[PDB]
Write a structure and sequence with these properties.
Chain lengths: 52, 52
């Protein structure tokens, strides 16, 4: 947001590559977080039955 | 001067090529003009002598 107040022609190609990696990365990391959590939730299910 | 008040990323490559051609071109054209003129000047020289 800062380096491209006014278009920076030289860093332009990197900034793009960067925006991609960091975004792409978090996107994956974020996803796995969710799956990890969902699976944890599923864990209690069996026990929850045995309880009843 | 106009189209690049603020850098125009798309036309950037053309503008460059253009600036080159038009400049390169006139540079040649301008040169030949001079030579043409210089030679014209040289023309009178022989006659100028015969006169004297």
């Amino acid at each position: 947001i800062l380096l491209f107040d006014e278009y920076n022609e030289k860093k332009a190609s990197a900034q793009k590559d960067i925006l991609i990696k960091v975004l792409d990365d978090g996107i994956t990391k974020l996803n796995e977080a969710q799956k990890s959590l969902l699976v944890s939730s599923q864990s209690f299910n069996n026990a929850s039955g045995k309880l009843l």
